[PDB]
Symmetry: C4
Subunit: 479 residues, 4 copies
Amino acid sequence: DGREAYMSVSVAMPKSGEHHGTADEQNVKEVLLALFDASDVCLETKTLATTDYILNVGGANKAGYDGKAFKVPSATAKVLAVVNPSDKFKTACVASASWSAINGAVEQTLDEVTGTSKNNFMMINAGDNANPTNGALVTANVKVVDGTTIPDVATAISEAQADRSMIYVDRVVAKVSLGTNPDGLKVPAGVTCTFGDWALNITNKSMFPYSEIVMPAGGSTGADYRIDPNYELAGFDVSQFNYLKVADDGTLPADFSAMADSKYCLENTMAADAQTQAQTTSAVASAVYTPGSFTVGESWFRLLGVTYKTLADLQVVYNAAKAAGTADAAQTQVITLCDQFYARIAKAATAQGKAVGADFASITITELDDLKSGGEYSKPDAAAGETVGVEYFQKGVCYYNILIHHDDAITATMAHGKYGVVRNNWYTLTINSVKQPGTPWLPDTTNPTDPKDPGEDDDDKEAYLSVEITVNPWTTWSQ
Amino acid sequence: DGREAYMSVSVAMPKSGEHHGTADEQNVKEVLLALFDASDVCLETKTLATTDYILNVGGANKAGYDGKAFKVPSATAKVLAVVNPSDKFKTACVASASWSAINGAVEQTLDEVTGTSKNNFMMINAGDNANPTNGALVTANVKVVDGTTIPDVATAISEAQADRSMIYVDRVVAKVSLGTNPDGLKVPAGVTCTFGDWALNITNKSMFPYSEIVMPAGGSTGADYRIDPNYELAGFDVSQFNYLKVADDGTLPADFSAMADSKYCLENTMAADAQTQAQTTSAVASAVYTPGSFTVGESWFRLLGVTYKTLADLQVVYNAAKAAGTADAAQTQVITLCDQFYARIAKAATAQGKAVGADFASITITELDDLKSGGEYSKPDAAAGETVGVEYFQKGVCYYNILIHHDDAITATMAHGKYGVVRNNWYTLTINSVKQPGTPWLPDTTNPTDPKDPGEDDDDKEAYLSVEITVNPWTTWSQ
Amino acid sequence: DGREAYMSVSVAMPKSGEHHGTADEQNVKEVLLALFDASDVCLETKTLATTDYILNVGGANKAGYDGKAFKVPSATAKVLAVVNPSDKFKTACVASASWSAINGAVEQTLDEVTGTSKNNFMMINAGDNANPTNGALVTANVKVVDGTTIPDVATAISEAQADRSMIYVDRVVAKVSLGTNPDGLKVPAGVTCTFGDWALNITNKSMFPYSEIVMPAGGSTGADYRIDPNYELAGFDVSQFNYLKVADDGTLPADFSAMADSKYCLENTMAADAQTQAQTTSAVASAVYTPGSFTVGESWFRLLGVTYKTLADLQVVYNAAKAAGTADAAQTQVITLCDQFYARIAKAATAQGKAVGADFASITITELDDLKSGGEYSKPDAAAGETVGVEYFQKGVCYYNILIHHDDAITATMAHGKYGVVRNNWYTLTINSVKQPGTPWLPDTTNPTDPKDPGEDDDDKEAYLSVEITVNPWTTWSQ
Amino acid sequence: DGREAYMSVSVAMPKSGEHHGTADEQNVKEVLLALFDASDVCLETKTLATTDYILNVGGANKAGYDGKAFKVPSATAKVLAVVNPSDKFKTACVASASWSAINGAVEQTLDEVTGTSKNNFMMINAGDNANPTNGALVTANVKVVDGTTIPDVATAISEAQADRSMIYVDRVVAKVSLGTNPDGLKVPAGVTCTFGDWALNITNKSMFPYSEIVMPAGGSTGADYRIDPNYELAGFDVSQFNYLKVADDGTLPADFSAMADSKYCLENTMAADAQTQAQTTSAVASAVYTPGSFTVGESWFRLLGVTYKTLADLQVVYNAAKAAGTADAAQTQVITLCDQFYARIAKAATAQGKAVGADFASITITELDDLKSGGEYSKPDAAAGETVGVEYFQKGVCYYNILIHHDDAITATMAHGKYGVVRNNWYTLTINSVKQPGTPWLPDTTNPTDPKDPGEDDDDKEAYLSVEITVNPWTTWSQ
Ligand SMILES: [Ca+2]
Ligand SMILES: [Ca+2]
Ligand SMILES: [Ca+2]
Ligand SMILES: [Ca+2]
Ligand SMILES: [Cl-]
Ligand SMILES: [Cl-]
Ligand SMILES: [Cl-]
Ligand SMILES: [Cl-]
Ligand SMILES: [Cl-]
Ligand SMILES: [Cl-]
Ligand SMILES: [Cl-]
Ligand SMILES: [Cl-]
Ligand SMILES: [Cl-]
Ligand SMILES: [Cl-]
Ligand SMILES: [Cl-]
Ligand SMILES: [Cl-]
Ligand SMILES: [Cl-]
Ligand SMILES: [Cl-]
Ligand SMILES: [Cl-]
Ligand SMILES: [Cl-]
């Protein structure tokens, strides 16, 4: 300590052609540097000016980032660079704190690590793929003025600038894209099915600034996995993830936007047995599904394996069942399920300040179609022990749930690394075929009677679409 | 009303690789913002400065478009953005007008919505593909200073800037490209056929600022159709469209230009039974067609299924028919049709102040070839009840009519969405083969005796070329 | 005349992906505008400033080229734009001269129409492909202040700017590229053959500023041909073309450069019967050819179908022939041809101030290899009636002659448009295979005893290489 | 001498699409020009300002490089341009020195010819591929003021600028890239193998500023070879090359970095019989190799063809061998080799200040895994006559040695030009398959008992990987 010591740094962003990010995904607003002693204790933090570092983007040094040497404590052994640090990270990462303390798990909103304008992506030391035990911190090439080896500060500065500490950084979030096959979508005979707005579901609420690298068996080079804060199966709780929900007034979550938009999420990984549907990040795709002979955009129904073109056609079956002198098992089940549908529709009508008929036989399609997210209310109430009955595809709208796969070389049932979203990976989802209608309601893989129920295994999920998922490193480009 | 209220906006231009438009096709001269209350009544309009919005082009925020929050009426619920508004739109879109009134059908010239220099393309709210009933207007994220939730104007400004209203915009016109197969053109044995200048025909005179989205049966994702002001078959009138016409002096319309040029048009859609040849936007391609053994560029003729290398060869047949003691059916028909040709040629000669022989037997190729657009005058006069007779391919020039198809997944006869030109779509026409000569005259699918005759069905059109038509979204690129 | 008249212009450079030229090939140093009356008589010429025109490059208007209207004579009917005019063109193109006079054939060096730094390419009105009779001149949209239709100069200016005269321009030269197959070159068994510097041969000395378009029979769309000043067979003279020649001191022409370089030439077209080897522009490719078992780069010889590894091996055959008591036909022919070789080698030695042995039996490889372009002197002296004898492949160097083909759809023997180099076309030559050694000397298809001998027919040329020739329009790109 | 003489120059960087270098690989910090008389004696050197030359990058002249003529000695005949000259070159290349003296072989570190920031690449005259005897120097187009041909200095300046001396330059180093097959890596059944950091090995310590071009038999066009300072087999010494070595404390050389990084090296060529493993530049690839059923990242062992999951499993075999009453050949060999392993491990423990058990039976995996580069110490001590015994794959880490091939058209055993790294070539190495584990230690093809032992023939090397090596010219791009 007390000695004159200098170092220089180069911050290098991910590099490889087709998977370069946008200008906003590589925008730099702030660079924080944390200097650690040999015991991984932070000695000092520094907010870097453009003169203080080399910025290598898309494999090239950016003009205006000078890489001039700067003074550091002589005990500096290791370095951490954080591009666009969140406010929680800036508060945790201070002098006298240890790297273990600074790297504690934290809750973060997506905006806190990407910016509300999606031009402020937090990035941190990438770590070594074939050396996971090494961790995040990079060796600091400190030139200590000792009068012998390094005689003056001018020599320390020239030596530091000729021996920069190269720090590769990774964005802390994953990127996801959704699209349909450009050559056309395969659909059942006579069906029309067009896709609309989408959203990510089951996104992580929390992360480690730097998660530990784990290499799964049968894993691909560059498909490194990570240990996030909700990794083991036993610790599961719905409070750990963000779930898509329709508002009380029937308003869809603001998360839905055009398929032309890419979406981001905190990383979300799992142990092999934790690859369960209530804790796996998924893409929710909305569509308008039109069975053959039906008019596109017109509401249609399904009950007990029977499709009904109109509410009136379904009411014919209900009225016949109610007109029975002594109702049999099939007739009783029709009345039960239409009445369960009616009470949920009546509840939604009240919550939206809208009028509906007095019972299932008296409701009209005009009253139903006027309810915002009307199809959501055909979802059975699992807390009442209800199971799927009436499905109301309001204006033909339905939703699909797509589990996001991670390493495409891993195909075995519930194998480690098969599912997940890892930082700085760009997941591309291409819908190739539609096998059947989705659900009228937003997918819900959780248990309303148990917040610790992790849901069904990911490989038990019923197939509704044929989706091709590719994973690529999310790189940067030089102007 | 009267309360301090702020909002921020982001104007996003179409985005996806190969179908990016030019710099001029994304140039911004003006941005008008219309603010609506919950009843869709315009409260205020604002001409935005570069400081007042985010401009997202080719998926990235453009430098210089700051996105700073601006003051708005507290009753603001919805927003409309118009890039490069036409003068009629700027006059219609004023405070106190309703959205239904502002969105009334209007006549527009192509220059009024693209600019005379084709660098001033009008763009408006794109609307939702899987939610057509929702319309154009986007929810405004208004931050109202209420002292409670939002304490001061600085908070309203920071909250508005952290929650921008994202408005996707679409250009109001379609883009069309014409070319030949790069690997070569298939032609009949010994034929030479080279293509020259082209033009769009039957372009709409009118449009809705925002036309209603309709989703056809069997339609593709992203191939959304629209309802324009001349959609139903019964309303057809030739006064509704722009048609290519040769001037009185034989001058070709200025609309013709090199195949290297792309062309634009107002959108023009139809009901399934309105897909008729007098109301479908088409590409008119000019060519020089040379039958085998003939000299390229030399005038040639056709009459009653017989091709004649020279006018003199045709005059031999005419003179033999006139020399008959008693002319039979075939001979009489030859005289009738050559005499009908002569009178139209003599009329054109007078209109151009040019000399021709006294009758069909006395005219020469020198006199005919000196007439501007000479081939146009071999067109029969349908008002006189004339039908095709002599075809004069002046210097081998002929024209082809190409109906522009919309959704390539729709192939059934006269199926909804098979034909049309929709806003913000780039139609690429590739000529692969020539089957026979085109017409000596500009294509004319109208009835001169009836302005309400919609012409033959689009799927009844005789095939002269083999053309591949692809449709792609017309996107933008970031520098 | 005397009336206030205004016009505006747009100069558009060639446009289409892979065949975009370089920044230097589209650089603008000067723009001359010639204004013509209805009789094609030049009324005025104007050197345009950046404010006076729109410059459309790679399909987009370039920033800084304002397109502001400018005053012109009221009798202006037509317009010619010349980008980077040569000094001869600037002298010919003056007020009171007719377009026929200005467009007279002229001699031009390549530097006079491309610039000595190859950043000053002359460009002129492109003309209509399907209307060759129309010529170069484009209709001028002149807005004449008549107080009635056009009331004031401000209106004339606004109307001119809203109705610009669009002038497409073409570079007056052709571009040629030479390369080998990237996947490898097919060569005879055990042969090594590597290609080096190349040059264009038989380049035109003269041109028309605007040559007449001609459309050949069987021609492709966009493969338009032209009539240059040395088109008919009867007019041929070697004085009309530039030919590659070795200097008196053995120095190679400066025209030779690396295959990485593209080359340019004035256009050079021919009538079908004028496609002869002394008047067809060709690419001359140099190579080092090594027969199997020979050392690469070592001199080797050929005489009367026999290859000799060394001069000494050939001298063995000569000495055996001279030692014969009575020499037979074969022995006499060996002595004749080696003695003819010796006298040309001795002449070259004298011209270079170098020493050689007294006769063929006394020369050594050291003396021969010290002669600059030594292989050139194995060329027979046709003025003495000599025919091919000794071939001296000095350091294995040989040359190939590649006739440049124009329309790849034209394959018939000596068919019109099969050979030639047309303005604004980019010819790509890809060598795929080597069939045999080239010549030790620069190719020479001329007759030294007759400057009017047009040489053999192009389709009579013996095949030494397999070369793929593609022709593409040479386009421009926008930044 | 004493006369006014002027010249102008153009410095042209390598040009062709996919093999363009980065902006840093074409950055210009300094340009030295050396002017030579007809005897190849340097008359003067000049440090050029941006006004003094044309800079052609990616085939286009860069803005700001004016190419204005400059004064030179009248005896100037030839010119050498050096972009970013090393300090040794700037000291050697002075007036009065001959080109043979300046072009003497020298030792250079990679930083001295690329810059410590890898943005200062030394470049020099490229030379002629089909004329190797010609050498580096380019003819200088000197315009000497003689009052006759050249009357004044203004004429000398204009003539020099109209006749620039074009100098093509090549970077003096090679570029190397390493990656895995994007479609996936083929591995043995049940094996996991992921690649990590890599480095170049056996890089040249020395070079000629301009090495002589040699053209191998069967060589490809553009695949020119060179004669470097350690070319003949007889001259081999390990002192001539840089070799990768683990530090005394077990630290890996700093040369190792991510596969995303490209690496550079001085050129290193060989005579056909000098293509030996101790003098051929190679890529060393690190990996984590996991045999089937083993846990990824856990240490594993191999001895006498037997793989052991744990140290304890191997100690079972050792203890059984030591417990034998009379040890046989197999048992004795096990004890010998484990004891040889133990003594090297104990030596490494001492050098790192770490504790280990007293003998092979007493060591634990915890003690071994705590040693830095632990696997390095399973390398047999060849100076003690040791051969491969215990292989300790510490945390599964192993290394592969990839000999870099030069001309892919050369495949014959030990054929000239098959191996090597030549200046201004970009070598791409793609790993397609893993056949077996690499070595626990850094590859070492040298003999510790003989610094003149050139190692085994390159074509005798045992195959561990299937690697595809492509070679391309390393070009430049224009903005
Ligand atoms: Ca998790
Ligand atoms: Ca219509
Ligand atoms: Ca010619
Ligand atoms: Ca060597
Ligand atoms: Cl923690
Ligand atoms: Cl935003
Ligand atoms: Cl709510
Ligand atoms: Cl997002
Ligand atoms: Cl209306
Ligand atoms: Cl314009
Ligand atoms: Cl008219
Ligand atoms: Cl247009
Ligand atoms: Cl002339
Ligand atoms: Cl130059
Ligand atoms: Cl000479
Ligand atoms: Cl050239
Ligand atoms: Cl030396
Ligand atoms: Cl650096
Ligand atoms: Cl050491
Ligand atoms: Cl390196």
